[PDB]
Design a binder for this molecule. Sequence first.
Ligand SMILES: CCCCCCCCCO[C@@H]1O[C@H](CO)[C@@H](O)[C@H](O)[C@H]1O
Length: 381
Amino acid sequence: RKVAWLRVVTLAVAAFIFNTTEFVPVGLLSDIAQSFHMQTAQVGIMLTIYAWVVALMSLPFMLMTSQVERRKLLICLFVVFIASHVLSFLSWSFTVLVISRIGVAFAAAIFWSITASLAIRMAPAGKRAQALSLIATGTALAMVLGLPLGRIVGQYFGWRMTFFAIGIGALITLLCLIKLLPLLPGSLKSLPLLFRRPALMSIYLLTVVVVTAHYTAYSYIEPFVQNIAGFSANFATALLLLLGGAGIIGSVIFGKLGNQYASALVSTAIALLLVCLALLLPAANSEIHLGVLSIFWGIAMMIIGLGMQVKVLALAPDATDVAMALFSGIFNIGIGAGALVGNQVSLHWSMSMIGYVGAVPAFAALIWSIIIFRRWPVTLE
Ligand SMILES: CCCCCCCCCO[C@@H]1O[C@H](CO)[C@@H](O)[C@H](O)[C@H]1O
């Protein structure tokens, strides 16, 4: 009975680990830049490399791993994951670190498909939803607590110790899995149908554009706060914690408002995001200005996320799985797209302009957002 609750809790902690690793390079960019004598912007590629790999490869991986989803696949994953983190610990060239990130990406690609599927199969019927809420909470604890813990463990002991501590969480959980996995062992034909419905494909587009805006600025926030506002390294840590809390507030704001205003919430939130990206550099002349702007930014992108999610949910009630898969796929597509353009703008123009540049896709989203929310006003309840 409480056994099953533990198996869900362990899949959730594994989600925590996989997302803290997926996020924390933002918090470690400058330490990594120093430690290889290069610009923080070029590491943005490690941000891009992982995300685009995860997106494009999760489908062929989840495809080739389709036969044995037994704890064998989990253990194989966790072995590959802890190994990659261990290689990041000992990286002697940025090229090495990028390779290690690629390994984390393969692990995450297979982990996510398998873990989504597995959290339910190991829990009772009423916990079929609560189990979802658990591993989701893990990912929340990932961006809310996980990124700032990783960044402070880097401030103390090197980002090598950051990645090391993460692999260590992975190891104790691989053990837990071996000692709790129950030896436990295809909706892809849906895929062309979704590719046909214009509403769903247009939500996919709107996501890609807004997320490219957001990650164009966010990917390089730590190097921004230090190198351009001139502020401390601890202050960057405060901002990452603050973004987490604002995501908590955006969740409760969204949960309070309800889905009647979902389209509205989102479109207005995209407006907020444009404001934040426009006002990013001006808010640097003072510390408290960037603090306000972080609260607003975090609430905004949280509400945008929850809204796009609800929209893909309502636009494909027949294939919730494949749509959320395509969803995280195009989402990581945008994560890497934003990091890549942020890299390009940091390298060729000043990094001080990322916020300004970022507003350009955001605006597009906003306009498009308004348009498409006029046209398919469909939601959940
Ligand atoms: C079906 C065609 C291709 C589908 C590809 C689907 C898998 C994409 C990976 O999704 C992952 O799931 C988690 C959900 O939170 C995220 O935290 C993680 O960052 C995200 O990368």
